[PDB]
Amino acid sequence: CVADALILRVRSELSGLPFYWNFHCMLASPSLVSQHLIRPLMGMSLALQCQVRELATLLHMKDLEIQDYQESGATLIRDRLKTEPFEENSFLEQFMIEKLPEACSIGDGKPFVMNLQDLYMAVTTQEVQVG
Amino acid sequence: VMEELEQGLLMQPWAWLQLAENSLLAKVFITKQGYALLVSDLQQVWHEQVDTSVVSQRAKELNKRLTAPPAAFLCHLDNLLRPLLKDAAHPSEATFSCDCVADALILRVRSELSGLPFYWNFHCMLASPSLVSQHLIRPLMGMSLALQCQVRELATLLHMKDLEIQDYQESGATLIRDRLKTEPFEENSFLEQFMIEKLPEACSIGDGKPFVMNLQDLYMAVTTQEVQV
């Protein structure tokens, strides 16, 4: 890192013989960084929120199924499988108080590459298709 | 002073600004010693941090006769701006205009206090790479990771309820109403169907209104956690 530029040196063995390359990089313009990082990430966040809402709806439907089965006089063989009714606010509060610190740890970019790369590609493809 | 303004700007949530048939995303932190402002339009980001002396000078140049201390001027500016940022459709008179230069952006604010005019201008230059990074790139990644964790937890809960459904079906009972039956949950099929059908409409960010409307508590929590460490 010299001045505002970046020199990335790559050394390799092309059939056992030297292979040197030097990428000279200059700070990207605001448009490139924006369209590459900011908007896609917002799309991924919105998609994940929609997925969470759909999962909450499915959980509510399952809760209705449980309630109707209880009303039908049915008895479960094992009492340990009983699950508490799902409430969105309580679940969100518990998550935010307990597991947010570990979940939000960006670290050094490894979790982003490992976990969220299909959503990023899909959002980018949608953006390209739109225009 | 400057550190306090930077921390306040970092900890503030985004707001939607409707101005001259155009949209912007704004964060403002005003204290008696100065103010900080961050503006964006999903294409570029501008930042402006101003102290007391510049406040007094600009208030004099624009309002040629408004003889008030900088603290009162900043307090009035905050009182005028915060109601709009917190919620739209407020019954307040505050018109916003935007002008563009090679690199600068001029945000003109006009309003009335007790029926008399009140003008202000923000000269927002392009923000440095560090500010835009720390304000958008990292918090958004944290929000995405947290949302994925929430999705995984919800999937686990759905699996547990599916186990309960299987147990109750094995018990041999039947529902009084058959319309409530739901098929077993499979994560892969659900994800594939979501991607095929709902992703195009859900990933549409538009002019930024969905971001402020939906994701503003998770963003604040992620930023607060980042501030601590």
Side-chain angles (χ1 to χ4, degrees):
Chain A
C1 197
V2 62
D4 289 345
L6 183 148
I7 308 302
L8 201 163
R9 323 207 191 244
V10 156
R11 177 175 205 291
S12 181
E13 294 219 54
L14 174 127
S15 195
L17 257 189
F19 187 89
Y20 294 140
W21 187 245
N22 281 358
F23 303 98
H24 298 58
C25 322
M26 314 226 63
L27 281 159
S29 59
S31 151
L32 221 68
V33 153
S34 176
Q35 101 182 295
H36 275 265
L37 283 162
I38 308 184
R39 310 212 283 286
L41 288 166
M42 292 183 37
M44 317 182 27
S45 298
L46 296 166
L48 295 164
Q49 188 89 95
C50 278
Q51 269 175 75
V52 165
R53 214 152 298 161
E54 281 216 349
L55 292 173
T57 292
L58 268 64
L59 273 177
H60 269 297
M61 282 328 78
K62 301 237 180 225
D63 184 1
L64 270 283
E65 206 154 357
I66 298 314
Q67 186 173 355
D68 216 315
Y69 260 116
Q70 298 339 288
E71 290 279 15
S72 292
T75 192
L76 68 174
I77 310 109
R78 325 200 203 240
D79 71 4
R80 102 191 201 285
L81 299 176
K82 155 162 280 193
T83 36
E84 329 81 350
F86 171 75
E87 183 49 37
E88 210 174 277
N89 331 91
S90 94
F91 162 79
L92 290 198
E93 162 172 333
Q94 294 296 335
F95 178 80
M96 224 77 82
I97 63 153
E98 281 295 0
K99 291 196 199 336
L100 181 43
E102 294 89 359
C104 95
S105 266
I106 179 64
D108 54 352
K110 220 167 183 227
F112 179 66
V113 161
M114 289 323 176
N115 309 352
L116 311 111
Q117 281 302 305
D118 55 328
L119 205 62
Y120 175 88
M121 272 205 278
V123 169
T124 280
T125 292
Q126 193 63 31
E127 262 199 327
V128 157
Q129 276 188 345
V130 162
Chain B
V1 186
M2 71 305 288
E3 88 287 23
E4 196 55 40
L5 287 173
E6 258 175 275
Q7 290 290 329
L9 198 74
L10 186 57
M11 262 189 328
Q12 276 284 314
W14 288 94
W16 195 66
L17 237 54
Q18 169 66 269
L19 53 95
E21 290 177 349
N22 215 334
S23 92
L24 281 181
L25 271 63
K27 282 162 58 144
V28 190
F29 182 76
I30 319 194
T31 189
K32 318 278 179 264
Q33 302 330 78
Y35 79 84
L37 157 79
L38 198 76
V39 183
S40 162
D41 65 317
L42 298 316
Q43 300 223 358
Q44 270 169 325
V45 183
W46 296 281
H47 165 84
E48 153 156 17
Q49 170 157 359
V50 131
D51 65 354
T52 319
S53 92
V54 170
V55 155
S56 160
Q57 164 166 356
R58 210 181 272 162
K60 164 52 211 73
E61 293 177 350
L62 284 160
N63 314 266
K64 64 225 179 193
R65 59 225 170 184
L66 188 147
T67 79
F73 187 84
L74 287 165
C75 181
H76 276 290
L77 199 74
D78 182 18
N79 245 26
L80 191 94
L81 257 53
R82 200 66 53 173
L84 261 165
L85 275 36
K86 86 157 256 204
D87 194 5
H90 221 54
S92 151
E93 325 200 331
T95 324
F96 288 61
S97 318
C98 167
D99 289 14
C100 261
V101 200
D103 265 348
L105 170 134
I106 289 300
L107 192 71
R108 292 175 167 84
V109 156
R110 173 170 148 63
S111 80
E112 265 139 38
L113 76 175
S114 88
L116 305 318
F118 182 91
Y119 302 82
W120 186 240
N121 292 353
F122 308 94
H123 299 17
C124 327
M125 297 296 180
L126 264 156
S128 56
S130 161
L131 230 56
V132 81
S133 160
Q134 181 174 10
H135 276 257
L136 289 143
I137 282 159
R138 271 142 77 196
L140 291 168
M141 284 205 229
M143 298 178 16
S144 290
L145 293 161
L147 294 165
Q148 210 146 58
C149 283
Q150 289 186 35
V151 161
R152 304 281 190 51
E153 274 202 29
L154 286 160
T156 281
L157 264 55
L158 270 162
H159 274 323
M160 262 163 59
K161 264 150 208 255
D162 184 1
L163 292 201
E164 184 153 333
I165 287 328
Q166 186 173 355
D167 182 293
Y168 252 103
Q169 292 286 17
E170 291 301 82
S171 292
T174 38
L175 297 96
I176 193 73
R177 24 183 162 173
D178 303 308
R179 81 186 169 132
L180 303 174
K181 163 158 205 203
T182 76
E183 100 191 346
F185 175 86
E186 201 243 333
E187 86 284 22
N188 224 27
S189 149
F190 158 85
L191 246 196
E192 272 164 9
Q193 221 297 315
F194 187 79
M195 301 275 138
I196 276 295
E197 193 195 20
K198 274 213 161 143
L199 180 56
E201 310 323 301
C203 91
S204 148
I205 48 184
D207 53 8
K209 298 179 51 48
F211 179 54
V212 316
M213 265 180 14
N214 293 33
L215 319 159
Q216 279 305 299
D217 300 81
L218 198 65
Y219 171 84
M220 277 191 59
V222 171
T223 300
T224 284
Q225 224 264 330
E226 184 167 10
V227 156
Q228 305 211 286
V229 55

